[PDB]
Design a protein around this nucleic acid. Structure first.
Lengths: 144, 143, 95, 181, 97
RNA sequence: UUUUUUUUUUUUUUU
C-alpha cells in the first residue's frame, strides 16, 4: 500500500474550501501583477529625465537642504562629491506594517524604493516562444 | 595455529575446548555456506569485485556469515541496501563489547561511559559518508 | 507505569521533506498505518481449576479420614479463582 | 502571578509552497544553533504534517462537447517543530523567525505554566538510638524525558476536546433552529 | 587499561576523524574558474610592492597541497576498514539462529 | 476471558 504517494487525497476531493488549511493566492497576485507594469513604463522614463541635465544637478538638492534643516549637515568642500542620485519609484502595494524584525519592508520609513538598472534573471519567464503582454508599443504591420 | 593465541581474551565457557574441537564445527560450517550460495543475488555478485588475481578470500568479516541456513531473514536485506539504521549504533556496540569484557577477566571491571561517547563517533562519520559504505562494499576506495 | 516505550525523533534521523521519492527507493513497502495487535489473556489455568473443584464435593459423604477432608475446605475457601459464578459454594460448605 | 509564569513549550509550524524553499529553512535554522551561551543548544524535534494538494477542473478549447479536460495541480508543504523547557526566549524566538527564506510563513503557539503553592515540608528527619533494655548525545534534546511525557499528554487532551466541541457547532445556515419561529 | 579506555579510545578517535573542514571543501580551494580574471587588486599585486598582503603563488605551489591531501586520504581508508566493518559484524550476528 | 465479551468492514493521520 502506497501511503506517501497518496498523501493529500483526503483534502482534495473530500474537503471544503472554507474547512481546509489551503490559503487563497488570488489576493496577493492582484497587487503584484499590476505593480510590474508600473516599474517597466516609468523605469526608463525616470532615468532619462534625471540624466537629461548632467551638470548643475546638485545645485537644486543643495538649496533644498537649506530650507528643511537649515544647516547643511552633508556639506562638503568643492573638491569632494556631494551625492549620487539613484532613480527610485514609489510603492503601490498596500503592504501591512508587520512586527517581523527580520522583514525587508516592515522597517520602511519612506515611500520610495531603489530600482535595479539591469536584471539578468527576468521574473516573468515564459514557458515557450510566447511574449509578455503589453510589451509592443508600436503597432504591427502586415505584408498586404 | 590460532586457538592458543585466542585462549586469553575470551569467555570462560568458550575457552575450555581444545583446538581439535573447534575444527570439527568449523569444517561442517564452511560446507553449508558454499552449498547454500548456489532474493540472495543482490548481495553476492553485486557487492563482490572480481580481480582474477586474488587466490583466496576472507571469511566472517563483512558479508560471509550470512546464508548459513536454507532461508535467510527477509527484513535483514532491507537494513543493508535501502537504509542502515544509525540510531541503534550505541545499542549494538554495548551488546558486543560486553562479550569480550565480562568485568571479571583481563579487562577492567569498570565500563559505563564508553557507550555514551561511542555514539558521537558514529554521528560524526555520518557526514563523511559512513552510510554509503554500508550499501557498497569497501573495495573501490581501497583500490 | 503504562507507557514503557517513549519514541522521540532527532535531527540525524528525520524524514526528508520530499517523501514521495523515498518510497521509490525501497524494495518493498516498509512504513504502514499504525496497526498493532494486543495480547488477550486466556483462562490461565482457571478452566482446569473449575473441574478439580467438583471432585472435592463428591469426597464429603464418603466417611473418609479427617486428614483427607482438610483439602476440600481449602478449595471452597478460595478468594480469587472460584469467585461466585455458580451457587455451589454455600451448598458444598453446608454439606 | 505574571512573574511566576514560564514558557512551557513553543510549537513552531511552517507552510511552504515549494520544495526548495522548505529545504532552505531547515538549513538556516540549524546554522543558527550551536552558537548559544549554554553548552548544549536548544534542539527542537521534527514533526512532518503531510502535504495537502488541490486541483480544480475545467472544460477543455471553447465550443466543444467536453471531450478533453485540463487540470491545474497546486501542491503544498507543511512542517511542525516542538520545543520543551525554553529557558532563553530571545535565543529561540529570534532564531525561528530569522531562518525564513522566500514565501514561507510561520505560526507559533505559546504555552505558559503557573506554579501553585511551592511544596515546602519534610524538615530534618528525626533520629534516635535503641534503649538497650553528562551522557549527552550530539543531536538530542537536553531536557529530561519525564517532563516531555507530562507535557505531551496535555496537548493530546486539548486537541480531542476542541474537535468534539467544533463538530457540535457546525450546521448550515447559522442561527437557524427547529420550530423556532 | 582502565584509565586509557574510558575517555581515550571513544573520545580521542573523534578528533582524528573530524576532517570535514578539509574534506567538505573543494580539492582546488585557492584556485577557481575565475582564478585568472581581474580578481587580484592592480594597485597591490601588479608592482609587487607588498610582501605579506598578497601572494600570487597558488598556480604552481601544489607541493604543500599534495602533501596535505595525501595525509587526509590514508586515515579515510582505515575508518571504513575498521569502523564500518566492525559494525557489520554485529548486524549480521544479530539474526543468527 | 469458568465473575471476560455479548460483536460486520471504507476512500489523511499514533511523525
Amino acid at each position: 500500500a502506497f501511503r506517501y504517494r497518496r498523501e493529500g487525497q483526503f483534502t482534495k476531493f473530500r474537503v471544503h474550501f472554507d474547512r481546509s488549511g489551503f490559503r487563497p493566492y488570488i489576493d496577493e497576485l492582484k497587487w503584484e501583477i499590476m505593480d510590474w507594469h508600473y516599474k517597466r513604463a516609468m523605469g526608463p522614463q525616470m532615468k532619462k529625465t534625471l540624466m537629461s541635465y548632467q551638470e548643475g544637478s546638485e545645485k537644486l538638492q543643495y538649496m533644498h537642504d537649506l530650507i528643511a534643516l537649515g544647516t547643511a549637515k552633508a556639506k562638503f568642500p568643492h573638491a569632494t562629491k556631494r551625492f549620487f542620485f539613484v532613480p527610485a519609484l514609489p510603492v503601490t502595494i498596500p503592504y501591512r506594517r508587520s512586527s517581523n524584525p527580520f522583514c525587508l519592508l516592515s522597517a520602511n520609513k519612506t515611500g520610495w524604493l531603489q530600482w535595479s538598472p539591469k536584471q539578468r534573471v527576468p521574473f516573468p519567464q515564459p514557458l515557450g516562444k510566447r511574449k509578455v503582454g503589453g510589451t509592443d508599443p508600436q503597432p504591427p504591420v502586415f505584408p498586404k | 595455529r590460532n586457538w592458543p593465541r585466542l585462549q586469553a581474551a575470551m569467555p570462560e565457557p568458550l575457552s575450555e575446548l581444545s583446538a581439535d574441537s573447534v575444527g570439527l564445527w568449523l569444517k561442517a560450517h564452511l560446507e553449508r555456506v558454499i552449498e547454500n550460495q548456489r532474493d540472495g543475488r543482490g548481495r553476492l555478485l553485486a557487492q563482490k569485485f572480481p580481480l582474477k588475481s586474488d587466490e583466496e578470500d576472507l571469511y566472517s568479516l563483512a558479508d560471509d556469515f550470512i546464508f548459513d541456513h536454507e532461508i535467510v531473514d527477509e527484513q535483514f536485506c532491507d537494513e543493508r541496501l535501502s537504509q542502515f539504521p544509525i540510531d541503534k549504533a550505541g545499542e549494538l556496540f554495548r551488546r558486543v563489547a560486553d562479550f569480550f569484557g565480562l568485568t571479571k577477566g583481563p579487562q577492567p571491571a569498570v565500563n559505563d561511559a564508553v557507550v555514551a561517547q561511542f555514539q558521537n563517533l558514529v554521528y560524526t562519520l555520518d557526514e563523511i559518508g559512513l552510510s554509503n559504505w554500508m550499501k557498497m562494499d569497501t573495495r573501490e576506495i581501497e583500490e | 507505569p503504562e507507557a514503557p516505550p517513549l519514541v522521540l525523533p532527532n535531527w540525524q534521523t528525520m524524514h526528508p521533506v520530499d517523501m514521495e521519492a523515498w518510497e521509490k527507493k525501497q524494495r518493498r513497502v516498509v512504513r504502514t498505518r499504525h496497526v498493532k495487535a494486543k495480547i488477550i489473556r486466556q483462562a490461565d489455568g482457571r478452566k482446569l481449576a473449575a473441574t478439580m473443584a467438583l471432585h472435592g464435593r463428591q469426597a464429603i459423604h464418603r466417611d473418609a479420614a479427617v486428614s483427607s477432608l482438610v483439602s476440600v475446605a481449602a478449595m471452597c475457601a478460595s478468594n480469587s479463582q472460584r469467585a461466585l459464578r455458580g451457587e455451589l459454594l454455600p451448598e458444598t460448605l453446608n454439606l | 502571578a505574571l512573574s511566576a509564569y514560564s514558557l512551557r513549550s513553543l510549537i513552531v509550524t511552517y507552510n511552504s509552497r515549494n520544495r526548495s524553499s522548505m529545504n532552505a529553512t531547515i538549513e538556516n535554522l540549524k546554522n543558527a544553533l550551536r552558537w548559544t551561551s549554554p553548552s548544549e543548544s536548544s534542539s527542537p524535534s521534527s514533526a512532518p504534517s503531510s502535504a495537502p494538494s488541490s486541483a480544480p477542473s475545467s472544460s477543455w478549447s471553447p465550443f466543444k462537447y467536453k471531450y478533453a479536460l485540463r487540470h491545474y495541480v497546486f501542491e503544498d508543504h507543511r512542517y511542525a517543530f516542538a520545543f520543551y523547557d525554553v529557558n532563553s526566549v530571545q535565543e529561540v524566538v529570534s532564531a525561528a523567525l530569522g531562518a525564513m527564506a522566500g514565501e514561507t510563513c510561520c505560526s507559533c503557539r505559546f504555552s505558559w505554566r503557573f506554579a501553585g503553592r511551592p511544596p515546602v515540608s519534610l524538615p530534618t528527619p528525626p533520629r534516635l538510638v535503641p534503649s538497650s533494655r553528562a551522557t549527552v548525545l550530539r543531536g538530542h534534546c537536553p531536557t529530561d524525558k519525564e517532563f516531555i511525557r507530562r507535557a505531551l499528554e496535555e496537548e493530546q487532551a486539548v486537541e480531542r476536546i476542541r474537535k468534539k466541541l467544533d463538530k457540535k457547532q457546525l450546521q448550515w445556515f447559522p442561527g437557524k433552529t427547529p420550530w423556532a419561529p | 587499561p582502565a584509565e586509557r579506555l574510558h575517555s581515550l579510545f571513544a573520545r580521542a578517535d573523534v578528533l582524528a576523524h573530524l576532517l570535514h573542514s578539509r574534506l567538505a571543501l573543494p580539492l582546488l580551494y585557492p584556485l577557481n574558474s575565475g582564478g585568472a580574471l581581474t580578481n587580484p587588486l592592480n594597485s597591490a599585486a601588479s608592482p609587487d610592492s607588498p610582501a605579506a598582503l598578497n601572494s600570487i603563488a597558488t598556480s604552481r605551489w601544489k607541493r604543500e597541497e599534495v602533501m596535505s591531501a595525501l595525509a587526509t586520504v590514508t586515515p579515510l581508508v582505515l575508518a571504513a576498514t575498521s569502523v564500518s566493518r566492525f559494525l557489520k559484524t554485529a548486524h549480521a550476528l544479530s539474526y543468527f539462529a
